[PDB]
Amino acid sequence: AYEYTEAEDKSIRLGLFLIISGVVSLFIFGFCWLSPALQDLQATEANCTVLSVQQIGEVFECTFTCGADCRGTSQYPCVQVYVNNSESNSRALLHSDEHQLLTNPKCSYIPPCKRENQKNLESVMNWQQYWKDEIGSQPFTCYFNQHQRPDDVLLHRTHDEIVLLHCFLWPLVTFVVGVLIVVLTICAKSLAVKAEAMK
Amino acid sequence: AYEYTEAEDKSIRLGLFLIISGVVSLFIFGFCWLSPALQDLQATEANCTVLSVQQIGEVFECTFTCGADCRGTSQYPCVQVYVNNSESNSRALLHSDEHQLLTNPKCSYIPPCKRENQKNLESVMNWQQYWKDEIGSQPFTCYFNQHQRPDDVLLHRTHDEIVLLHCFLWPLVTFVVGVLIVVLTICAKSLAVKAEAMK
Amino acid sequence: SRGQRMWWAFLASSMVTFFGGLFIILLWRTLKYLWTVCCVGWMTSVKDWAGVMISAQTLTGRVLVVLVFALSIGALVIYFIDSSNPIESCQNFYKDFTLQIDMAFNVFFLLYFGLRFIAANDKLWFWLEVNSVVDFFTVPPVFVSVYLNRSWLGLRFLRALRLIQFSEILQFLNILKTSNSIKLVNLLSIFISTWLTAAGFIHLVENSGDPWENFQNNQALTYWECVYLLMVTMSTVGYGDVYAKTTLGRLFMVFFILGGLAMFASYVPEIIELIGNRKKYGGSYSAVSGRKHIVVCGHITLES
Amino acid sequence: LLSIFISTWLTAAGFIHLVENSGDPWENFQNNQALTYWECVYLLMVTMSTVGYGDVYAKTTLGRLFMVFFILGGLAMFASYVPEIIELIGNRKKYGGSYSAVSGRKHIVVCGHITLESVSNFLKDFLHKDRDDVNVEIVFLHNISPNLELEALFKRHFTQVEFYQGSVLNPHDLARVKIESADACLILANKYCADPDAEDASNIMRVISIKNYHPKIRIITQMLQYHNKAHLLNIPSWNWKEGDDAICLAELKLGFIAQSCLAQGLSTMLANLFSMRSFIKIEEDTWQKYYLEGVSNEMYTEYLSSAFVGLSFPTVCELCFVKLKLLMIAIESRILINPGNHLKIQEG
């Protein structure tokens, strides 16, 4: 009997499944992980000097939450912080991330929503006072993408560089383990064939 | 003929169905009845002294209803009543129940919504005047749960202790009646077998 | 005299009637088979008279059976009227007309239940028969409603289960003889009664909401919205304009689609098969004056 | 089927619960659609059934991706397994159970070739109003379940006829119909069968089975040839003295023909003497108007008065004809037909 058993056939099927799973997960992560991360790295790490700090008076709505699923909607004032870029050197806005920019593009900082509107206003005033002290000096290591959003300047990138590592790592680990299973099963079968035919 | 008839087989099937129904209803009431009731009893009955009574001016919306399905939305002012706890002894809010807390966390009392905004305001002013008289004295038998909502203090628990009785009673009654049906049918059959074989 | 919800008295009267009579029957069958181990008649004549009256073998049995048909539809219509009412409400018996007509219908059902009890061979098999369980959950609580002068739309939707009897009580009356239309009325009765009963249960559950939120889940549906919900659901269309929102409502809908989808997919094409079987080339030839005709028979195919 | 269905349902609901709560890692987990576990169980039952309300659905990218794979598998799983489960439940034997005898009223077990038309012709000739107030019950016994027309016929005779599905060869089914206390057992034959020796063999086997259970029963049967009737006397319990009659159709049809070879038209008269027919009044003057008056007579059996004892046979036939308007034919003290004037009426 020089043929695979049921366990070796199932093990080859498992190794082939892990090869397919590694390729498919890499194919999935190319559109989910990689492409917005490459759009993030398309934004250039640049310098920026703060131009001015303004308030508008038009308040917006946050959402504070208690323990047992409260949906209290307190309100918070708005501060616009305009900067002077190093690349374009135009009137650009400041933002903490794409998250703050997409929930409210017309402000530069959104506080953690609390119950009291006085506490939200105090969080605004503390952050505004810090950005009112350091004016003109110490140009910031900020980020900018003139091809997509040329009017807004971020403070932190959304995705780390290690995202590019983990997007390519675990599909490759899945591929290697699947290849090792097929190789070890075939090698064990061929050595057992030679060990039985050696007599 | 020493065997069950069709009626006895159907009666054994009914008794087995009531046994299964009692177990399944107990299994259902464990996740529906028991678990939020045990979260209610997790809150500790404590003492609390009233700290202060404030108004904010930010009015909210109630919904008054006429006979033939009116959906009039009158408005009502807000009163925040802050207390001093006995356990944490911090600035905690007052609430009537979890119902008032979840519909509006930023107030201490929501009136029954009427047509006139003047009548809602008068209900607010009467309840506020009662909570403006008794200040400092007579610490209240209130409730508190620092692990989930440590900033709010309730006046009434949502679920009674008799909830724990009815959650375990009627599945047990269903189980007992089902067991009695299977036992009485089997006992009647075995006695009829002995009564026919006695000749 | 509002405020006191006495809904539990109706359901208690139904459960005490069903299970108390069941325990009395089982205790009779233990005591009469302990009496030897430890320690033509006249009742058969009244049994054969009741068995004749339940069938349509006489004239007065035929009148009784037609009354069962008509008053079953009448009691169902009274449920359709009462379904738009609030859940717990009062009604004076001498002023409420529909309560008086419902009284007349249910005292008739009580007498007919007594005839079916006498006519049966096996008292246990009768007490577990499904047409008796309908009487245990409909006939007591209307007497409790007249005693309390207070109504509760409880398990009144089980009045729609009385349409199961229709094919049998038409087989008694020599109306249904051949096998196709016996089967057609059987399929139609089971389909419509299951549809209307399950719509009534989801109507009760969705209106009187979940007891775990202290009844703040009252999705105010009418009865006909639940009938439309179940026809949209059974057909697997599922628009989503109307759906069950409570926990007990979704739980019943899970069990209902497990049963009712197979019921719809099996019964509806079979019903459409049994209707529509019409003979195409029936009728007769009509001769005309001054022109003769020729009849051709034998091996008739396309090429011949 | 139940184990695979429920385990697949609960497992896939748990996976979609994990994926929908801990949201997509690509948005830094801002896709947390906070579903409970039971909402995902309800989601998958709404989805597997192809209802799809849309009140609850997966909103994340991994959630929609699993739902695409789940409907590719789970729709075929639901549509295959659910009607098969409903087939395997609900298979209940309808006409089980046993006959319950009543005091002071005997019953009759009928087996053999039981169809709709044979039972209809039997119940016409048995429950006819031209008999006295009969009170026997008729119990049937056939292994094939009846169709809807036979069930409607049994509902038309709800107090006189009970059906019980079983086989006459199996002695448990003979115990179910109370064959030990039955008054007689009747075995109808399929007179238009394709092989007459085959059904004569089968009905002989039925007589063997009933006599194997209870030998002291009265069996009435139908045979299609005469030699198969001759095999029935070899059975050690077939006692015709108490009433085990074998109605041989070959012997009776050829004898009816031969008696009509002597006097033409006798076979019609004899065959009309046993079909129970009520009087049908014809207003016209046709041949049927006098023929139907001949049809309405049937053969009957009765004891005689004490006042007739000692008289002669032509005397009592003449006087019952002119006073009582009855036609006497034969006598029993044997079963000889039309004795002379020399034989006198015995008492009894």
Ligand SMILES: CCCCCCCC/C=C/CCCCCCCC(=O)O[C@@H](COC(=O)CCCCCCCCCCCCCCC)COP(=O)([O-])OCC[N+](C)(C)C
């Ligand atoms: C084929 C094999 C490949 C498999 C790939 C496996 C690799 C897995 C991935 C690899 C990398 C992932 C780890 C990196 C985390 C980075 C840290 C971080 O982002 O913190 C975040 C934690 O936010 C949370 O709330 C976490 C809660 C969910 C954690 C559970 C994850 C389960 C993922 C599903 C498991 C499914 C398992 C399925 C198993 C079958 C905080 O971020 P933020 O605060 O919200 O940002 C706010 C934005 N702002 C700053 C502007 C305000």
Ligand SMILES: CCCCCCCC/C=C/CCCCCCCC(=O)O[C@@H](COC(=O)CCCCCCCCCCCCCCC)COP(=O)([O-])OCC[N+](C)(C)C
């Ligand atoms: C397996 C066998 C087990 C069966 C278990 C049976 C046990 C049944 C249960 C047992 C206990 C239930 C009774 C306790 C009630 C407590 C009193 C109460 O809560 O009052 C409430 C009456 O609110 C209403 O409006 C009532 C209207 C619905 C009543 C009909 C119930 C039918 C339930 C379905 C029947 C289905 C029957 C199905 C039959 C097949 C008022 O509360 P609230 O005003 O709204 O609170 C406001 C909050 N706030 C104070 C902060 C503002």
Ligand SMILES: CC(C)CCC[C@@H](C)[C@H]1CC[C@H]2[C@@H]3CC=C4C[C@@H](O)CC[C@]4(C)[C@H]3CC[C@]12C
């Ligand atoms: C098999 C079961 C469901 C039968 C029904 C039993 C239950 C549902 C019924 C019978 C006894 C009833 C209780 C009787 C007494 C209490 C307190 C009283 O002041 C008002 C009603 C109330 C609050 C009832 C609640 C519902 C109840 C618990």
Ligand SMILES: CC(C)CCC[C@@H](C)[C@H]1CC[C@H]2[C@@H]3CC=C4C[C@@H](O)CC[C@]4(C)[C@H]3CC[C@]12C
């Ligand atoms: C099935 C039949 C034979 C027995 C049914 C039991 C019925 C008749 C009995 C059992 C429970 C009873 C209820 C128990 C307590 C309530 C409240 C009380 O303040 C007055 C009587 C009243 C309103 C009763 C009405 C009648 C009642 C519903």
Ligand SMILES: CC(C)CCC[C@@H](C)[C@H]1CC[C@H]2[C@@H]3CC=C4C[C@@H](O)CC[C@]4(C)[C@H]3CC[C@]12C
């Ligand atoms: C109000 C209700 C509970 C009354 C209950 C009456 C019951 C206990 C009694 C009345 C007459 C009895 C029946 C009398 C004779 C029949 C036929 C017999 O061969 C077996 C027992 C059986 C089937 C009995 C079963 C129990 C029985 C039905």
Ligand SMILES: CC(C)CCC[C@@H](C)[C@H]1CC[C@H]2[C@@H]3CC=C4C[C@@H](O)CC[C@]4(C)[C@H]3CC[C@]12C
């Ligand atoms: C409350 C209930 C019991 C009222 C019924 C009254 C009973 C006792 C009366 C009314 C109808 C009667 C029946 C009328 C005619 C039949 C057929 C006859 O050939 C013998 C007597 C018999 C079988 C009678 C038995 C007794 C009887 C059933």
Ligand SMILES: *[C@@H]1O[C@H](CO)[C@@H](O)[C@H](O)[C@H]1NC(C)=O
């Ligand atoms: C611009 O950015 C770099 C960091 O990338 C910083 O070190 C440097 O000082 C800046 N250059 C000027 C001219 O400001």
Ligand SMILES: *[C@@H]1O[C@H](CO)[C@@H](O)[C@H](O)[C@H]1NC(C)=O
């Ligand atoms: C500031 O902005 C102006 C125009 O907005 C631009 O010309 C100049 O280069 C910037 N200067 C600095 C120091 O960034």
Ligand SMILES: *[C@@H]1O[C@H](CO)[C@@H](O)[C@H](O)[C@H]1NC(C)=O
């Ligand atoms: C605290 O609460 C109890 C009631 O639980 C009350 O009787 C007591 O007076 C309170 N104790 C103090 C020290 O206030």
Ligand SMILES: *[C@@H]1O[C@H](CO)[C@@H](O)[C@H](O)[C@H]1NC(C)=O
């Ligand atoms: C009141 O509150 C303060 C702080 O908020 C706390 O230190 C003190 O214990 C409380 N006193 C009383 C009497 O509750």
Ligand SMILES: [K+]
């Ligand atoms: K569908």
Ligand SMILES: [K+]
């Ligand atoms: K659909």
Ligand SMILES: [K+]
């Ligand atoms: K859909």
Ligand SMILES: [K+]
């Ligand atoms: K939909």
